[PDB]
RNA sequence: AGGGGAGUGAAAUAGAACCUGAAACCGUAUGCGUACAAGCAGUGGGAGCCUACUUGUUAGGUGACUGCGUACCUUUUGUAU
RNA sequence: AACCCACUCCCGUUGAAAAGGUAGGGGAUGACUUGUGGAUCGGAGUGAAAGGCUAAUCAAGCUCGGAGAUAGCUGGUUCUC
RNA sequence: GGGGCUCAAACCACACACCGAAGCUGCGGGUGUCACGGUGACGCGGUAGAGGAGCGUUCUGUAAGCCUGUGAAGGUGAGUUGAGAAGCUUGCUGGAGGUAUCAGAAGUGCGAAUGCUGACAUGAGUAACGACAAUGGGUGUGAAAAACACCCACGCCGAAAGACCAAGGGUUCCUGCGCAACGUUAAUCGACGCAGGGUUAGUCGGUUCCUAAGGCGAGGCUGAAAAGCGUAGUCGAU
């Protein structure tokens, strides 16, 4: 089985997004969706759309069932970062890095 | 310490705090159901409940006292005419507070304040 | 003829970093720290090829000492008797008989006592 | 003040061993079957088996 | 936005920030070690466990316990300094 | 009072600010303050004079050339036996 | 040095044994010099420094050759070979070039120079989010609203935090459609993106007329040259 779904350039840092990703690893799809629907973290809203579409890919493309599935694999990679400038005191400039990440969720009946 | 102390500061001055709970109580008697933050909803029942008790006895002295505390002519009219007659035999507890969730903007716990026997 | 260093510099770093396998932290993944660890590991290896011969001889002696006293003799009195009779077996073989061939070690010990030493 | 030596990979990951998030208390509304937060109004408008806000 | 199929192609992990695509750096998975233990982090010795196969005088991974052990460069009469 | 100035305290010192702010403070019809246009400059200008100011630069501005000035002084100097 | 030590595990004489270095010997190898015609003997710590012998990289000849889409260079593992720099053979990736041997030429070998240029860590998910006039509900739109619009109610300025000229800026002005980036948060909003539109003078401000300070200046006077001063003149608003 093992259908995947990826979200590249997710506008959030990887360390922030990995705290949510550890909550759903190995859990069933039915209960992993509830845990994300009642979470205050912003990453839980981004990762809920990736998981919800990985289940859809298992339906149209592989004719699976929602009940059998579970989250076999989930990981968060880094991505491209935007580099900006922040003006500080006494004529000094700081570099700001706006980080992103790649979110990948795999579901499987196995 | 704050042993045995009552009240919530809510990061406002006393004039601001006193003025904000007048608006909430005046809005509550008109809409019968409002949505606010949970900490603010719990400090409102110490303001809006003593006003409903006062309206059970209608007299010039009581209406003047009610207008000094809710400086709204409609709220004084709503009391003494609709509430206080509806709650004429209720030994307190005229408003109900229910947790409803958290705001999107800053994740603040919200609530529903309503009157107990709403016509709805 | 301009010469570019990219290809021979990479093979030279990789030889050092392959010898630093199994080390801790930056000692196995950054070249500057890994080069010093590889050089230091070669100083110890050179020096411990000498200690290895010292540490094993001290181990054989301590075990002949224990085996001789079960037969009623100290290590120094055993070696004096062994040189006196004729016997010239190693310390490495004597320590092996003490553990395993205890009945052969007993015959050698009572041979050394019979030499009146 | 500032560090005299940079921290290692293991040192900074040991400090983050207390950063794991918790799970909320979710109940199932007995009449219908909606999942809500415990002691909170349902996303539909039900609490303890009664319409309260009618959306 | 981004993806899962399907099509084009000799090849899409050649998909437009597109030949090859290293290192620092950041992850997931498996094997072994690790919560009574003091120090340049290695080396001499060394048990147990895991895998492979020519089934143990073999190969690979880990390294409990233990002897010894105060980085490199420069400048100096002389530096763990 | 407006306006011009900067005597004191505290805050700020990675500042809201490469010289400020809040409280008090001095002059306030004059040797006053100010807008617009113009004149004087690098061993030269201007100075109720502090070696002060001349574009956040002054016991001799900035820029391009002589110019890769010179450095008996620090630092560094790359594969093997 | 510690435990601990009293007819000692202290001290004074005598005796026999043992431990103990990379010292010496045994065994197996490599080298320097000298001698003899492969043996023999004496050696082989080393900074500054002198002397001898080599490896590898880029280009040229050998080469109109040899290898290569039945897979070049490059990348990444494994195995093996030398005393070393290093060589050799193969799995996977890659997809078109490489250069035996012996010579010739060098932009010929990097860990350091508070070296130069890019990328990425630690501090750390830490400080901070820019005046302490102040916000509370309802409704609407929307995928989504503390922040957008509208309503009810609060606060703040009011010799300004209101209105208007000049300088300076340059389309920021209005409307429709948008939210990637910009906005120290979100955004459906914007001084942001795209596209359209918008500025009407005999009397307002310029130009035109006149000059101040000052500038330029036909001839002219001066000055190695560039040029300086200046007359008639003509520019120059405040
Ligand atoms: Mg500035
Ligand atoms: Mg950083
Ligand atoms: Mg109490
Ligand atoms: Mg007051
Ligand atoms: Mg290099
Ligand atoms: Mg190790
Ligand atoms: Mg590594
Ligand atoms: Mg430190
Ligand atoms: Mg340090
Ligand atoms: Mg230091
Ligand atoms: Mg880790
Ligand atoms: Mg933490
Ligand atoms: Mg590929
Ligand atoms: Mg790229
Ligand atoms: Mg091509
Ligand atoms: Mg590529
Ligand atoms: Mg890599
Ligand atoms: Mg693990
Ligand atoms: Mg203990
Ligand atoms: Mg233990
Ligand atoms: Mg420790
Ligand atoms: Mg320690
Ligand atoms: Mg060991
Ligand atoms: Mg070993
Ligand atoms: Mg083994
Ligand atoms: Mg050890
Ligand atoms: Mg030790
Ligand atoms: Mg140095
Ligand atoms: Mg010195
Ligand atoms: Mg000295
Ligand atoms: Mg030290
Ligand atoms: Mg040191
Ligand atoms: Mg020393
Ligand atoms: Mg002024
Ligand atoms: Mg002054
Ligand atoms: Mg002063
Ligand atoms: Mg002062
Ligand atoms: Mg004061
Ligand atoms: Mg004054
Ligand atoms: Mg002042
Ligand atoms: Mg006076
Ligand atoms: Mg001027
Ligand atoms: Mg001038
Ligand atoms: Mg000058
Ligand atoms: Mg002076
Ligand atoms: Mg002067
Ligand atoms: Mg200056
Ligand atoms: Mg000078
Ligand atoms: Mg000059
Ligand atoms: Mg120079
Ligand atoms: Mg010169
Ligand atoms: Mg040096
Ligand atoms: Mg080398
Ligand atoms: Mg005695
Ligand atoms: Mg020896
Ligand atoms: Mg020797
Ligand atoms: Mg020999
Ligand atoms: Mg020598
Ligand atoms: Mg010697
Ligand atoms: Mg050639
Ligand atoms: Mg191939
Ligand atoms: Mg080449
Ligand atoms: Mg190849
Ligand atoms: Mg190879
Ligand atoms: Mg070609
Ligand atoms: Mg050639
Ligand atoms: Mg060079
Ligand atoms: Mg070097
Ligand atoms: Mg380098
Ligand atoms: Mg260097
Ligand atoms: Mg060096
Ligand atoms: Mg520095
Ligand atoms: Mg450097
Ligand atoms: Mg961090
Ligand atoms: Mg801290
Ligand atoms: Mg803190
Ligand atoms: Mg803070
Ligand atoms: Mg603030
Ligand atoms: Mg501040
Ligand atoms: Mg603000
Ligand atoms: Mg509102
Ligand atoms: Mg609303
Ligand atoms: Mg706000
Ligand atoms: Mg006022
Ligand atoms: Mg203009
Ligand atoms: Mg524009
Ligand atoms: Mg506009
Ligand atoms: Mg619009
Ligand atoms: Mg934003
Ligand atoms: Mg959004
Ligand atoms: Mg615009
Ligand atoms: Mg005129
Ligand atoms: Mg004139
Ligand atoms: Mg003139
Ligand atoms: Mg003339
Ligand atoms: Mg004129
Ligand atoms: Mg004119
Ligand atoms: Mg005018």
DSSP string, chain A: --EEEEEEEESS-HHHHHHHHTTSTT-BHHHHHHHHHT---SHHHHHHHHHHHHHHHHHHTT---TTT-EEEEEEEEE---EEEEEE-GGG-EEEEEE--EEEEEEEE--
CATH of the domain at A74: 3.90.470.10
Matching residue, tokens 């200690």: C51
CB proximity A42–strand G (7 Å threshold) = no
Separation in Å, CA of A60 to nearest CA in chain D:
26
Within C 10-49, residues with CB less than 7 Å from strand G: 10-15, 18, 31-33, 35-36, 39, 47
Cβ neighbours for A16, distance < 8 A, ≥ 6 positions apart: A41, A42, A43
Phi/psi region, residue A105 (left: phi>0; alpha: psi -120 to 50; beta: rest), is beta
Within C 60-79, residues with CB less than 7 Å from strand E: none
Matching residue, tokens 């349902």: D42
**C/D interface, count of CB pairs below 8 Å:** 3
Distance of CA B26 to the CA centre of its chain: 7
Cβ neighbours for D32, distance < 8 A, ≥ 6 positions apart: D44, D46
Residue ranges of A 2-41 with Cβ closer than 8 A to chain D: 19-20, 22-23, 34-35, 37-39, 41
Q: Strand E: which positions are within 7 A of a protein CB?
A: 1-5, 17, 22-29, 40-45, 61-63, 67-68, 71-72
CB proximity C110–strand E (7 Å threshold) = no
Ligand nearest to the CA of D3: 8
Distances (CA, A) of C45 to B34, C22, C42, C49, C50: 80, 16, 5, 6, 9
- CB-CB contact of B33 with B113 (8 Å): yes
Residue D10 Cα to ligand 21 midpoint, Å, equals 14
B21-47 CB burial, b ≥16 within 10 A, e <16: bbebbbebbeebebebebebbebbbeb
Q: How many CB atoms lie within 10 A of CB A10?
A: 21
Distances (CA, A) of C100 to B111, C38, C58: 84, 41, 19
Separation in Å, CA of D54 to nearest CA in chain A:
21
Matching residue, tokens 């590249």: A8
This structure's resolution (Å) is 2.9
Residue A105, judged by CB atoms within 10 A of its CB (0-12, 13-18, 19+), counts as buried
Within A 67-106, residues with CB less than 7 Å from strand F: 87-92
- CB-CB contact of A103 with A47 (8 Å): yes
Pairing of strands A93-98, D26-28: unpaired
Note down the domain range covering A73: 2-110
Minimum CA–CA partner of B38 in chain D? D40
**C33 three-state secondary structure:** helix
Residue closest to A93 by CA, chosen among A105, A84, A102: A84
Q: Which residues in D lie closer than 8 A to residue C25 (C-beta atoms)? A: 8-10
Minimum CA–CA partner of B33 in chain D? D53
Residue closest to B63 by CA, chosen among B106, B54, A64: B54
Residue closest to A47 by CA, chosen among A36, A58, A39: A36
Structural domain tally of chain A? 1
Please provide residue A85's backbone torsions phi and psi, each rounded to the nearest 5 degrees. Answer: -130, 135
Residue A106 Cα to ligand 50 midpoint, Å, equals 64
């Amino acid at each position: 089985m093992e259908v995947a779904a990826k979200l590249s350039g997710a506008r959030i840092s990887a360390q922030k997004a990995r705290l949510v990703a550890d909550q759903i690893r190995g859990k069933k799809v039915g209960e992993a969706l509830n845990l994300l629907a009642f979470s205050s973290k912003k990453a839980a809203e981004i990762m809920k759309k990736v998981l919800e579409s990985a289940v859809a890919n298992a339906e149209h493309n592989e004719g699976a069932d929602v009940d059998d599935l579970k989250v076999s694999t989930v990981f968060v990679n880094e991505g491209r970062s935007l580099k900006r400038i922040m003006p500080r005191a006494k004529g000094r400039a700081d570099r700001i890095v706006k980080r992103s990440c790649h979110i990948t969720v795999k579901v499987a009946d196995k | 310490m704050r042993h045995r102390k009552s009240g919530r500061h809510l990061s406002r001055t006393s004039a601001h705090r006193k003025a904000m709970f007048q608006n909430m109580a005046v809005s509550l008697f008109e809409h019968e159901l409002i949505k606010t933050t949970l900490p603010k909803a719990k400090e409102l029942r110490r303001v809006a409940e003593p006003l409903i008790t006062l309206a059970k006895e209608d007299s010039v002295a009581n209406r003047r006292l009610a207008f000094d505390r809710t400086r709204s002519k409609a709220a004084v009219g709503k009391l003494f005419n609709d509430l206080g007659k509806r709650y004429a035999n209720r030994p307190g507890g005229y408003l109900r507070i229910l947790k409803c969730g958290f705001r999107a903007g800053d994740n603040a716990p919200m609530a529903y304040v309503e009157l107990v026997d709403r016509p709805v | 003829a301009r010469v570019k260093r990219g290809v021979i510099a990479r093979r030279r770093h990789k030889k050092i970093l392959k010898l630093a396998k199994g080390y801790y932290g930056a000692r196995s993944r950054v070249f500057r720290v890994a080069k010093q660890a590889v050089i230091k590991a070669g100083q110890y290896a050179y020096r411990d090829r000498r200690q290895r011969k010292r540490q094993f001889r001290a181990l054989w002696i301590a075990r002949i000492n224990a085996g001789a006293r079960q037969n009623g003799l100290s290590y120094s009195r055993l070696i004096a008797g062994l040189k006196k009779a004729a016997i010239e077996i190693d310390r490495k073989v004597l320590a092996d008989l003490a553990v395993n061939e205890k009945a052969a070690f007993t015959a050698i010990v009572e041979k050394a006592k019979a030499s009146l030493a | 003040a500032v560090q005299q030596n940079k921290k290692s990979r293991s040192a900074r990951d040991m400090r983050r061993s207390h950063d794991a998030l918790e799970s909320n208390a979710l109940s199932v509304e007995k009449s219908t079957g909606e999942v809500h937060l415990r002691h909170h109004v349902s996303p539909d408008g039900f609490y303890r088996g009664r319409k309260v806000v009618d959306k």
